[PDB]
Design a binder for this molecule. Structure first.
Ligand SMILES: Cc1cccc(-c2ccc(-c3cc4cnc(NC(CO)CO)nc4n(CCCCN)c3=O)c(Cl)c2)n1
Ligand SMILES: Cc1cccc(-c2ccc(-c3cc4cnc(NC(CO)CO)nc4n(CCCCN)c3=O)c(Cl)c2)n1
Lengths: 264, 262
């Protein structure tokens, strides 16, 4: 975190994107390069208790250097305001892409393949994303897929061993990926019609979810492979990149531009 | 071209690196000098009518002496098989380096600068590469960047005047397409039938770099991609472009990108 440079002089704040975690997020411009950036502004006089969580996500993001993880450019402290500068992705999130009707299996497999590449990077680096879900998968305007919004070290995407507050590892992300696969196919995770506190006990207690509907058997088997109650029986991201569903259906990421355009 | 010595004695093939143009290509060793080489073997009966193109590419490589152009060591004819011996580069092509993910602008500028050094050498020697594209830019294990696979005298990288019938400015246009390729993964009109692209390049406005790239990188592409060849800058001029000056780094920096590819 840089305390001397004035971020209001280095960056031009443009449109508010949304109410992000702990702050507001803006589309901005790097004045020196004219690249578009994403700018999160957090009032530190207001979010006292959450500060440790903010520092930890900055630390993890600063240790990542992958085309599948949104790049962290730096942070600045101006008066009581912490400015966090990130890579801007102009294609929306995967959740945004679900709003009208269904993804087809080609779209699902392409998106999942890129998420798997991000998870393979993270797991090979001994990191855990901890909040894999469509709302945290961001797309560029040309279809590149990147992970954002790491979880802190709502229950619908949480693995059973996470909910039971046991130790967990990279296999927790694999379960969340399986829920995210269902989300990409159905628009919502399993149990989304139930109160979160009820889902809290349902996930450890119940059989794992399965993907129901008219889907090709490999897509159902992909979901089944991810959603195993036993974490050590879930495959790695590297192995899932060779799953028949991925190899048979995933296409060049640039084909997502059609879907992205249709939502912009 | 040596007809007396037997290349299966002078060279040890180590591994097939891939198929090339007209023939299979191997990583091998010169047993006399004990240095690794690249070996292309062309069957001159199977490849008849391409022979003049083969000869023209041997001639132009044999006249180049630059660290920015793959060295030509000589050729051997055994029965109907022509062995072409060249410098071996162990880091892959620039196109290969596009595989494990998007290239950032520091990577792009470093590669473009080295390509421009090669083009400046060639153009100053009154030569034209004629097939500048990521697939024909090769990297050493240590990040050095060299031109290979010259064109002789697929349209996506071709200048409009080459399509319509040129000089060194054709390479500058192809360099601009290659900059787009390094930034986006593929040249403009990648999805279209090559015969459509044949009329589109002369007809249409020149391509621009679209997306969230720095203004200098976009300006570099625009400078290369001028429909008028005489308005494209020399390679020497482009070495001073703001994009190159602000982003290019030592070639050794690419070793991490090359290692990630392995
Ligand atoms: C507490 C903490 C600590 C360290 C880093 C962060 C942090 C994390 C995500 C972003 C971020 C980066 C970002 C980049 N691009 C975009 N465009 C998309 C929005 O859908 C298209 O406009 N939105 C972004 N959105 C909004 C959408 C979030 C969805 N989960 C962002 O919030 C940012 Cl700017 C910062 N936060
Ligand atoms: C008709 C003709 C006439 C005169 C010369 C040639 C000729 C041209 C290129 C090479 C050559 C030389 C060479 C040297 N190093 C490498 N390794 C890299 C490439 O991926 C890492 O293995 N590959 C090489 N590849 C394979 C990759 C080519 C990409 N377009 C080669 O083909 C060779 Cl050995 C000869 N051809």
């Amino acid at each position: 975190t840089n305390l001397k440079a004035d971020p209001e002089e280095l960056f031009t704040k443009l449109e508010k994107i949304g109410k992000g975690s702990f702050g507001e997020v803006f589309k901005g411009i790097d004045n020196r390069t004219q690249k578009v950036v994403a700018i999160k502004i957090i009032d530190l006089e207001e979010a006292e208790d959450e500060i440790e969580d903010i520092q930890q996500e900055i630390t993890v993001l600063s240790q990542c250097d992958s085309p599948y993880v949104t790049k962290y450019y730096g942070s600045y402290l101006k008066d009581t305001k912490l400015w966090i500068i990130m890579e801007y992705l102009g294609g929306g999130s995967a959740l945004d892409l679900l709003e009208p009707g269904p993804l087809d299996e080609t779209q699902i497999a392409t998106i999942l393949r890129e998420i798997l590449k991000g998870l393979d990077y993270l797991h090979s680096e001994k990191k855990i994303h901890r909040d894999i879900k469509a709302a945290n998968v961001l797309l560029s305007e040309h279809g590149e897929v990147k992970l954002a919004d790491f979880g802190v070290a709502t229950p619908f995407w949480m693995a059973p061993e996470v909910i039971k507050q046991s130790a967990y590892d990279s296999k927790a992300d694999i379960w969340s990926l399986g829920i995210t696969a269902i989300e990409l196919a159905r628009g919502e995770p399993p149990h989304s019609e139930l109160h979160p506190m009820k889902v809290l006990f349902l996930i450890p207690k119940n059989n794992p979810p399965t993907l129901e509907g008219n889907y090709s058997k490999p897509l159902k088997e992909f979901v089944e492979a991810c959603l195993n109650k036993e974490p050590s029986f879930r495959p790695t991201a590297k192995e899932l990149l060779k799953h028949k569903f991925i190899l048979r259906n995933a296409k060049k990421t640039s084909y997502l531009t059609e879907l992205i355009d249709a939502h912009h």
